[PDB]
Scaffold this active site. Sequence first.
Site, PDB file in Angstrom:
ATOM      1  NE  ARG B 179      -4.139  16.377  11.173  1.00 33.82           N
ATOM      2  CZ  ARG B 179      -3.378  15.461  10.584  1.00 33.82           C
ATOM      3  NH1 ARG B 179      -2.119  15.751  10.248  1.00 33.82           N
ATOM      4  NH2 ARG B 179      -3.879  14.267  10.323  1.00 33.82           N
ATOM      5  CE1 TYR B 363     -12.778   0.023   2.703  1.00 32.67           C
ATOM      6  CE2 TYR B 363     -12.496   1.061   4.859  1.00 32.67           C
ATOM      7  CZ  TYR B 363     -11.968   0.637   3.648  1.00 32.67           C
ATOM      8  OH  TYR B 363     -10.626   0.823   3.377  1.00 32.67           O
TER       9      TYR B 363
HETATM   10  C1  FAD Z   1     -10.554   0.475  -3.157  1.00 32.04           C
HETATM   11  C2  FAD Z   1     -10.075  -0.053  -1.830  1.00 32.04           C
HETATM   12  C3  FAD Z   1      -9.040   0.596  -1.163  1.00 32.04           C
HETATM   13  C4  FAD Z   1      -8.615   0.163   0.096  1.00 32.04           C
HETATM   14  N1  FAD Z   1      -7.591   0.856   0.735  1.00 32.04           N
HETATM   15  C5  FAD Z   1      -7.249   0.459   1.929  1.00 32.04           C
HETATM   16  C6  FAD Z   1      -6.226   1.182   2.614  1.00 32.04           C
HETATM   17  O1  FAD Z   1      -5.555   2.085   2.126  1.00 32.04           O
HETATM   18  N2  FAD Z   1      -5.982   0.733   3.901  1.00 32.04           N
HETATM   19  C7  FAD Z   1      -6.621  -0.343   4.530  1.00 32.04           C
HETATM   20  O2  FAD Z   1      -6.311  -0.656   5.692  1.00 32.04           O
HETATM   21  N3  FAD Z   1      -7.567  -1.037   3.852  1.00 32.04           N
HETATM   22  C8  FAD Z   1      -7.858  -0.650   2.624  1.00 32.04           C
HETATM   23  N4  FAD Z   1      -8.839  -1.341   1.972  1.00 32.04           N
HETATM   24  C9  FAD Z   1      -9.527  -2.456   2.639  1.00 32.04           C
HETATM   25  C10 FAD Z   1      -8.824  -3.803   2.464  1.00 32.04           C
HETATM   26  O3  FAD Z   1      -8.814  -4.223   1.095  1.00 32.04           O
HETATM   27  C11 FAD Z   1      -9.406  -4.896   3.365  1.00 32.04           C
HETATM   28  O4  FAD Z   1      -8.391  -5.890   3.496  1.00 32.04           O
HETATM   29  C12 FAD Z   1     -10.698  -5.549   2.859  1.00 32.04           C
HETATM   30  O5  FAD Z   1     -11.529  -4.548   2.284  1.00 32.04           O
HETATM   31  C13 FAD Z   1     -11.574  -6.229   3.892  1.00 32.04           C
HETATM   32  O6  FAD Z   1     -11.199  -7.591   4.149  1.00 32.04           O
HETATM   33  P1  FAD Z   1     -11.915  -8.872   3.429  1.00 32.04           P
HETATM   34  O7  FAD Z   1     -10.973  -9.996   3.577  1.00 32.04           O
HETATM   35  O8  FAD Z   1     -13.262  -9.275   3.951  1.00 32.04           O
HETATM   36  O9  FAD Z   1     -12.249  -8.507   1.918  1.00 32.04           O
HETATM   37  P2  FAD Z   1     -11.723  -8.880   0.471  1.00 32.04           P
HETATM   38  O10 FAD Z   1     -10.449  -8.182   0.197  1.00 32.04           O
HETATM   39  O11 FAD Z   1     -12.836  -8.414  -0.432  1.00 32.04           O
HETATM   40  O12 FAD Z   1     -11.537 -10.482   0.297  1.00 32.04           O
HETATM   41  C14 FAD Z   1     -12.685 -11.296  -0.024  1.00 32.04           C
HETATM   42  C15 FAD Z   1     -12.202 -12.386  -0.951  1.00 32.04           C
HETATM   43  O13 FAD Z   1     -13.255 -13.350  -1.166  1.00 32.04           O
HETATM   44  C16 FAD Z   1     -13.228 -13.731  -2.525  1.00 32.04           C
HETATM   45  N5  FAD Z   1     -14.522 -14.297  -2.896  1.00 32.04           N
HETATM   46  C17 FAD Z   1     -15.708 -13.628  -3.049  1.00 32.04           C
HETATM   47  N6  FAD Z   1     -16.713 -14.397  -3.398  1.00 32.04           N
HETATM   48  C18 FAD Z   1     -16.146 -15.660  -3.485  1.00 32.04           C
HETATM   49  C19 FAD Z   1     -16.683 -16.921  -3.811  1.00 32.04           C
HETATM   50  N7  FAD Z   1     -17.962 -17.122  -4.140  1.00 32.04           N
HETATM   51  N8  FAD Z   1     -15.848 -17.982  -3.800  1.00 32.04           N
HETATM   52  C20 FAD Z   1     -14.562 -17.783  -3.489  1.00 32.04           C
HETATM   53  N9  FAD Z   1     -13.939 -16.643  -3.168  1.00 32.04           N
HETATM   54  C21 FAD Z   1     -14.793 -15.613  -3.180  1.00 32.04           C
HETATM   55  C22 FAD Z   1     -12.851 -12.463  -3.273  1.00 32.04           C
HETATM   56  O14 FAD Z   1     -12.363 -12.810  -4.563  1.00 32.04           O
HETATM   57  C23 FAD Z   1     -11.764 -11.902  -2.347  1.00 32.04           C
HETATM   58  O15 FAD Z   1     -10.462 -12.378  -2.681  1.00 32.04           O
HETATM   59  C24 FAD Z   1      -9.248  -0.947   0.684  1.00 32.04           C
HETATM   60  C25 FAD Z   1     -10.260  -1.610   0.009  1.00 32.04           C
HETATM   61  C26 FAD Z   1     -10.685  -1.175  -1.241  1.00 32.04           C
HETATM   62  C27 FAD Z   1     -11.796  -1.917  -1.935  1.00 32.04           C
HETATM   63  O1  UPG Z   2      -9.528  16.324  -0.378  1.00 27.80           O
HETATM   64  C1  UPG Z   2     -10.461  15.814   0.257  1.00 27.80           C
HETATM   65  C2  UPG Z   2     -10.416  14.564   0.957  1.00 27.80           C
HETATM   66  C3  UPG Z   2     -11.503  14.131   1.622  1.00 27.80           C
HETATM   67  N1  UPG Z   2     -12.679  14.852   1.656  1.00 27.80           N
HETATM   68  C4  UPG Z   2     -13.873  14.362   2.372  1.00 27.80           C
HETATM   69  O2  UPG Z   2     -13.506  13.256   3.180  1.00 27.80           O
HETATM   70  C5  UPG Z   2     -14.204  12.069   2.737  1.00 27.80           C
HETATM   71  C6  UPG Z   2     -13.275  10.888   2.836  1.00 27.80           C
HETATM   72  O3  UPG Z   2     -12.304  11.063   1.787  1.00 27.80           O
HETATM   73  P1  UPG Z   2     -11.283   9.977   1.268  1.00 27.80           P
HETATM   74  O4  UPG Z   2     -10.412  10.496   0.172  1.00 27.80           O
HETATM   75  O5  UPG Z   2     -12.002   8.682   0.874  1.00 27.80           O
HETATM   76  O6  UPG Z   2     -10.441   9.689   2.587  1.00 27.80           O
HETATM   77  P2  UPG Z   2      -9.676   8.381   3.075  1.00 27.80           P
HETATM   78  O7  UPG Z   2      -8.790   8.775   4.194  1.00 27.80           O
HETATM   79  O8  UPG Z   2      -8.889   7.880   1.845  1.00 27.80           O
HETATM   80  O9  UPG Z   2     -10.737   7.238   3.461  1.00 27.80           O
HETATM   81  C7  UPG Z   2     -10.937   5.904   3.016  1.00 27.80           C
HETATM   82  O10 UPG Z   2      -9.720   5.174   2.985  1.00 27.80           O
HETATM   83  C8  UPG Z   2      -9.024   5.135   4.248  1.00 27.80           C
HETATM   84  C9  UPG Z   2      -7.761   4.327   4.026  1.00 27.80           C
HETATM   85  O11 UPG Z   2      -7.185   3.891   5.257  1.00 27.80           O
HETATM   86  C10 UPG Z   2      -9.913   4.564   5.355  1.00 27.80           C
HETATM   87  O12 UPG Z   2      -9.264   4.757   6.612  1.00 27.80           O
HETATM   88  C11 UPG Z   2     -11.284   5.235   5.380  1.00 27.80           C
HETATM   89  O13 UPG Z   2     -12.134   4.559   6.303  1.00 27.80           O
HETATM   90  C12 UPG Z   2     -11.907   5.243   3.989  1.00 27.80           C
HETATM   91  O14 UPG Z   2     -13.152   5.939   3.996  1.00 27.80           O
HETATM   92  C13 UPG Z   2     -14.654  12.393   1.318  1.00 27.80           C
HETATM   93  O15 UPG Z   2     -15.773  11.624   0.880  1.00 27.80           O
HETATM   94  C14 UPG Z   2     -14.980  13.882   1.429  1.00 27.80           C
HETATM   95  O16 UPG Z   2     -16.257  14.104   2.015  1.00 27.80           O
HETATM   96  C15 UPG Z   2     -12.795  16.064   1.005  1.00 27.80           C
HETATM   97  O17 UPG Z   2     -13.819  16.730   1.023  1.00 27.80           O
HETATM   98  N2  UPG Z   2     -11.666  16.477   0.336  1.00 27.80           N
END
Ligand code: FAD
Ligand code: UPG
Lengths: 386, 386
Positions: B179, B363
Amino acid sequence: SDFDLIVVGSGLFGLTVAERAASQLGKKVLIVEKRSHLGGNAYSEAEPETGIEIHKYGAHLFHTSNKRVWDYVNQFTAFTGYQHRVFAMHNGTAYQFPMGLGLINQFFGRYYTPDEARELIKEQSAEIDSKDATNLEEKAISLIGRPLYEAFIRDYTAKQWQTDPKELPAGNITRLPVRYNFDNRYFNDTYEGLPVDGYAQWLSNMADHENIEVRLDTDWFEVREDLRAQNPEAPVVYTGPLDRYFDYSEGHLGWRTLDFETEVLNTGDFQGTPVMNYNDAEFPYTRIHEFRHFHPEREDRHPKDKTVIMKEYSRFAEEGDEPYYPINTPSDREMLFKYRELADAETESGKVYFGGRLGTYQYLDMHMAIASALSMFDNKLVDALK
Amino acid sequence: SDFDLIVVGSGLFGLTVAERAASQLGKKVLIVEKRSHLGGNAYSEAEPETGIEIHKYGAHLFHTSNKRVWDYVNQFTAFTGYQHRVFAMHNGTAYQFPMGLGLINQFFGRYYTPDEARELIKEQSAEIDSKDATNLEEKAISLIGRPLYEAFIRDYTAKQWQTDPKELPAGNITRLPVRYNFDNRYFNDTYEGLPVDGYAQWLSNMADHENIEVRLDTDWFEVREDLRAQNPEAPVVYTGPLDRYFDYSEGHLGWRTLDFETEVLNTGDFQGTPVMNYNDAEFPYTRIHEFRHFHPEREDRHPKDKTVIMKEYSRFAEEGDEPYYPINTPSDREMLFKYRELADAETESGKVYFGGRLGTYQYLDMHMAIASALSMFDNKLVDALK
Ligand SMILES: Cc1cc2nc3c(=O)[nH]c(=O)nc-3n(C[C@H](O)[C@H](O)[C@H](O)COP(=O)(O)OP(=O)(O)OC[C@H]3O[C@@H](n4cnc5c(N)ncnc54)[C@H](O)[C@@H]3O)c2cc1C
Ligand SMILES: O=c1ccn([C@@H]2O[C@H](COP(=O)(O)OP(=O)(O)O[C@H]3O[C@H](CO)[C@@H](O)[C@H](O)[C@H]3O)[C@@H](O)[C@H]2O)c(=O)[nH]1
Ligand SMILES: Cc1cc2nc3c(=O)[nH]c(=O)nc-3n(C[C@H](O)[C@H](O)[C@H](O)COP(=O)(O)OP(=O)(O)OC[C@H]3O[C@@H](n4cnc5c(N)ncnc54)[C@H](O)[C@@H]3O)c2cc1C
Ligand SMILES: O=c1ccn([C@@H]2O[C@H](COP(=O)(O)OP(=O)(O)O[C@H]3O[C@H](CO)[C@@H](O)[C@H](O)[C@H]3O)[C@@H](O)[C@H]2O)c(=O)[nH]1
Ligand code: NA
Ligand code: NA
């Protein structure tokens, strides 16, 4: 009658008193304003070449923790989600600001944890006890230490006051200006933003009421005998200069003023942020404002290749100069008490109330002016207008 | 019947589909959820010792520019005015982040204006043409130059992917990560905040409807023959793992997982900010979260002398591990197309729809899951449930 209340001056104090009388008591209000526009120093306008909203009497940032005031102002304008942040230019580097883990890392050369920074500040400031400080310089040092004081406080303060800080009151600093986290929100108030359609639209909306008449380019002292003769019983709310009202019979109250040097540059972005403080003595101005960044939501209305900046200079207010900040020397304080006695007598004999920044010789932020007007309305005007 | 629709999984996708069917079509919905709680990975809970809201499946930051989604979620929770900001720890210094005038000043040693920074980045990145880049490392360098790449991108990327960046696709970077101003808002979306009363309350509110039944601690594959026999015509929305549904007949889809090391420390403030990235190879974790700072509005409910932090480690997901991010090797992509054909056939024959992160091997952020569910509701379920 043609009016039930006269308000002198259309700053936020006058506008608030006028609008409350008009809408809450259904009274006819005449606003007399000396300038060619409403709103006092909060007024803003489009710069002709770029269209960018700018200020000619200082940049105005709205912020408050007073919910009554917040609810009130939102009747007249919506606010953006703007949050004021400032950067401090020292020795060729832009520092995060106010003082916090960010600045501390940048200045002392490596990362300090919250607890480590607390320890650092105790070490730095060990030199002087704040209980023993005799002036601003010592009081500052007793709180944050010499290196921080000399880098970020000394020259800036010197430029604003046109005085050596060794000659300023120890009472000018009253709390630790250091945060032990990475939070660089400049203000600490619950509510904050900028009028979505600019200050001029906001302040104009306040005066826009069937019960309100506005006369611009009109000096109270030139028209007062005629106006009051039309309706002798109508009270006056005066927000003009207090000392001028009583013909300077007790002397001239002292004010600080500001000079603004406004330029249109042939780039879309001069400093990448709304406000850059210039903390070093070698720059005669205290800070530069770049107005487009106060409204990033307006970016595709702003020019891509031009920008308006403004440099700010502080000095003592002489004849002609706009009075902005009360100096408050003990001489000032003494002739103020004398003027308060005259004003109080004038209220009793002539139904003239005194309010606002100029009317009371006191600096007021916008929300503080509004609160002060709401209070005068509640506690004085509702009874005076029955 | 006792239910008109079965939803497998109570993540944001499942919750959205269930709530829309319940409230808009007046249908009885049975939600089957394998875990002991609602909400999937967005679920949060109180840490027992401090009371601070924490996450066990990753920190969740809500942000969107989709107004329909924003209006929708605000039916179920209010949001704070939280704005995500991140700092990057490199070589003992906390840098402003993402890359911008702030980081550039800190890293290159003095202040660069917007235009000067543009020039600097062109000089630095001159070495490689992005059209000529053959991997992630080269693509990064072709955009921002070696010093920035090696300081802030190389090791972080290496830790997240457990791969040398020379072996990652040039397609992983698609735009200039720099930026030319001082804006360090982490996300660029119109709407942003955190649920005022936490995620658990929000997600629980979505499932709180007279037409919705929730069965926790229940695996779809253990109960499906019985449930469908109660009402054969009820469609199913499946958000469990896609490959598992078809008994891995086409192989196991590959996922990245995360390990979280959560600690309660005997200080009120560990790092003074919610998220600190650790960009250097010497730290095995990619970043540390300090949960109290996600909700500064809750400060007088939080302990003054304790804080919860969490270190985040990335690696390939093995048996047992929670699958979080699809790896998407060309092998993965190929067995995905095979699974899509099976799913499509299953929808036609068994009225089982596939959605969500696990159901489609993709994702999805929370707002993207919600949008995807709203779309499946609109375009598929309204007709299937007539
Ligand atoms: C590490 C991580 C960080 C994230 N950070 C962010 C973030 O900062 N911002 C953002 O906007 N989103 C974030 N997300 C995404 C967010 O969690 C979403 O809401 C989700 O990943 C996608 O929606 P979903 O309902 O399909 O998934 P899920 O959250 O995975 O829900 C699926 C559900 O189905 C259930 N299930 C699976 N198999 C079965 C079965 N056989 N029987 C019954 N139930 C079952 C699971 O237990 C779970 O509760 C993150 C996700 C992860 C993994
Ligand atoms: O200090 C940093 C941060 C990021 N990265 C690069 O950027 C990528 C993404 O980094 P990450 O820390 O995962 O960024 P997020 O913004 O946290 O991204 C994840 O979590 C977000 C939460 O909203 C989602 O929007 C995105 O789709 C998901 O990829 C990394 O793999 C690196 O290649 C660097 O090199 N250095
Ligand atoms: C440089 C500067 C920067 C500021 N920045 C901020 C900021 O960022 N945030 C904030 O909250 N506040 C800010 N303020 C304060 C803000 O402008 C307040 O609204 C104001 O200072 C106090 O309210 P007021 O109505 O009494 O004063 P004023 O704004 O001074 O209004 C008084 C009015 O009376 C008129 N008048 C005077 N004499 C006569 C006469 N004889 N006849 C008729 N009319 C007359 C004047 O022309 C003027 O329009 C700033 C003020 C200044 C000067
Ligand atoms: O880089 C800086 C900034 C401030 N100061 C000291 O702090 C004082 C106040 O500085 P200033 O730049 O005027 O701070 P503001 O926050 O802009 O304060 C004015 O403008 C605010 C706008 O809302 C009002 O709230 C305040 O009451 C009013 O004094 C100065 O005189 C200095 O002593 C420094 O030493 N260095
Ligand atoms: Na001290
Ligand atoms: Na290049």
